[PDB]
Short mmCIF file of C-alpha atoms in Angstrom, two decimals:
data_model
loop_
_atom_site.label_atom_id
_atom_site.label_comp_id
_atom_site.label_asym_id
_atom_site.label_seq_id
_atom_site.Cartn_x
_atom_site.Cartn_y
_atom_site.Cartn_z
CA UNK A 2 -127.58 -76.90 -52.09
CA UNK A 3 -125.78 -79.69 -54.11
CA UNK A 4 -126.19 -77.05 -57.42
CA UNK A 5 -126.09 -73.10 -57.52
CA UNK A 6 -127.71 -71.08 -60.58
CA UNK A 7 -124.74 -68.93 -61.50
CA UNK A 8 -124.27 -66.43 -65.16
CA UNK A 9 -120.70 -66.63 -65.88
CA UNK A 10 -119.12 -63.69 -68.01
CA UNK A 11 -117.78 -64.62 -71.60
CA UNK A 12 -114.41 -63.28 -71.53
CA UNK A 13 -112.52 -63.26 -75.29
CA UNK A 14 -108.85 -65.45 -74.47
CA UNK A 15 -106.83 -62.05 -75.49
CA UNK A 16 -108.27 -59.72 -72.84
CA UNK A 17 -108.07 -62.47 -69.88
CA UNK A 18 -104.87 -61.11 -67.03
CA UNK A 19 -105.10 -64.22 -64.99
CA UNK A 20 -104.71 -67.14 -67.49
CA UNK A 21 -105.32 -69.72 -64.79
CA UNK A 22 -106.06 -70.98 -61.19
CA UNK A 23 -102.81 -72.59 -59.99
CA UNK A 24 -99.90 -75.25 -60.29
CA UNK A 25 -101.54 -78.44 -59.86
CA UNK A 26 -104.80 -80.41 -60.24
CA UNK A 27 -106.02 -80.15 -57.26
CA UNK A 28 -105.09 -76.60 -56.57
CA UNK A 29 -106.49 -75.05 -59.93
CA UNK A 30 -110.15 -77.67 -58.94
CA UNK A 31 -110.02 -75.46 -55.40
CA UNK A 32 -109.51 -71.93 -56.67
CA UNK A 33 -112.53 -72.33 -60.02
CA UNK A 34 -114.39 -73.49 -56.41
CA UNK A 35 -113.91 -70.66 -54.46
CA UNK A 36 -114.07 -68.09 -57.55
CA UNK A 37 -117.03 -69.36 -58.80
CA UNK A 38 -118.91 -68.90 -55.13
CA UNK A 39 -117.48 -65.75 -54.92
CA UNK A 40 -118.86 -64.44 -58.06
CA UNK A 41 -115.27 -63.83 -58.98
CA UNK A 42 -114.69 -66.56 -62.30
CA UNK A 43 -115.24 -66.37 -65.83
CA UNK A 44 -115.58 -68.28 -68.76
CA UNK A 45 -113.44 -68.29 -72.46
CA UNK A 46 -115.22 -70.64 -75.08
CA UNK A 47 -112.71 -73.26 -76.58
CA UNK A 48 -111.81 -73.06 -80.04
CA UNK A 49 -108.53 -73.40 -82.25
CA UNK A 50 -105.88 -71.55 -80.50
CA UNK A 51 -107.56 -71.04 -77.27
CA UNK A 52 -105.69 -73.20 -75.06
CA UNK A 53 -102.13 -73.00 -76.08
CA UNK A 54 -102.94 -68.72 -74.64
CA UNK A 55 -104.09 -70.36 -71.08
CA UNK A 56 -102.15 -72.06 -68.20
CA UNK A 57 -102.04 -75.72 -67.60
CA UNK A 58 -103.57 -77.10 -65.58
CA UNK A 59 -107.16 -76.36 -67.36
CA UNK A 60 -110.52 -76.03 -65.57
CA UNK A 61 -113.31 -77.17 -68.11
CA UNK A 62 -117.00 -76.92 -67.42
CA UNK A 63 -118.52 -79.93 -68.93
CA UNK A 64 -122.66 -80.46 -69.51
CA UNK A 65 -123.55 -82.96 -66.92
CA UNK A 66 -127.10 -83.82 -68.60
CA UNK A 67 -129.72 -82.84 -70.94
CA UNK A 70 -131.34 -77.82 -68.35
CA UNK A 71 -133.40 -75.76 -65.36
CA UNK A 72 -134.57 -72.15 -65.48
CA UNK A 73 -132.59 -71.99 -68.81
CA UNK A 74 -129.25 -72.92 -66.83
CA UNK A 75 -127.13 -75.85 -68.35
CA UNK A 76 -126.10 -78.23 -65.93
CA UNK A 77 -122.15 -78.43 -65.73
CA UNK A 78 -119.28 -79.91 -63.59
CA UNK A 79 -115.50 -79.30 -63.52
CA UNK A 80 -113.11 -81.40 -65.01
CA UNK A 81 -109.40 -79.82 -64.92
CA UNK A 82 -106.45 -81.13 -67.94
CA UNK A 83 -102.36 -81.45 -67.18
CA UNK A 84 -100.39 -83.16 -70.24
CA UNK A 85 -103.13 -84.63 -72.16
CA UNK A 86 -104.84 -86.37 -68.79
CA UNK A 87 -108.22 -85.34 -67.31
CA UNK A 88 -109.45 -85.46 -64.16
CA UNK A 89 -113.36 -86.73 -64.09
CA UNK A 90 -115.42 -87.64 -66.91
CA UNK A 91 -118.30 -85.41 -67.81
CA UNK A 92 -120.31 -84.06 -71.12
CA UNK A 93 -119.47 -81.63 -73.78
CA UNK A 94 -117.31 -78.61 -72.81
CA UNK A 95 -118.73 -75.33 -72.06
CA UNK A 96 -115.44 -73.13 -71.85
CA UNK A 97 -112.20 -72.98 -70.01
CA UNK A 98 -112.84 -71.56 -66.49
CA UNK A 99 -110.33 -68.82 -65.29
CA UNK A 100 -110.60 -65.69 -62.58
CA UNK A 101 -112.66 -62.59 -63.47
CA UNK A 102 -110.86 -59.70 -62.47
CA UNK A 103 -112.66 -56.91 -64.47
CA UNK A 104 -112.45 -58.02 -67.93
CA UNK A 105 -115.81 -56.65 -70.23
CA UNK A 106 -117.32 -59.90 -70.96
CA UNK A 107 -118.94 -60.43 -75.03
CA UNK A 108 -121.81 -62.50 -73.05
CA UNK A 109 -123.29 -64.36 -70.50
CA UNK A 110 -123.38 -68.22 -69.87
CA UNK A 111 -126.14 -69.66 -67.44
CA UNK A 112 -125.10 -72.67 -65.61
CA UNK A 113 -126.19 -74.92 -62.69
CA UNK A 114 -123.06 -75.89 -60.60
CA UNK A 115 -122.62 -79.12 -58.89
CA UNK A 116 -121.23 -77.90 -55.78
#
């Protein structure tokens, strides 16, 4: 399937232990891949101070239109020095692996795969 229903936990940016995916563009675009298949990825909502707390490079989830079964649909879009990679929609949140953190909530989106 070209997009995958998935509910992403909320994680607040002070409780996250793995502030991001890896060391390059490419690398960081892989692992929010393979952690969001395996159920194993989570989501912090951007706001004032957010980012600076996270590593670089960034995995956004942008809205990719205007949303089925409730689910917004998003695609990834990853940041290093000011310079994205893709062009998409409004950002959801700042992707970065779930390893056991209490989430405050729940975000449905539909994944382009």
């Amino acid at each position: 399937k070209t997009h995958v229903q998935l509910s992403l936990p909320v994680l607040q940016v002070r409780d996250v232990l793995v502030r991001g995916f890896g060391d390059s563009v490419e690398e960081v675009l892989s692992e929010a891949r393979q952690h969001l298949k395996d159920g194993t990825c989570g989501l912090v909502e951007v706001e004032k101070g957010v980012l600076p707390q996270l590593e670089q490079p960034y995995v956004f989830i942008k809205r990719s239109d205007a949303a089925p079964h409730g689910h917004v649909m998003v695609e990834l879009v990853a940041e290093l020095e000011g310079i994205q990679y893709g062009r998409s929609g409004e950002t959801l949140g700042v992707l970065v692996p779930h390893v056991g953190e209490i989430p405050v909530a729940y975000r449905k989106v539909l994944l382009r795969k």
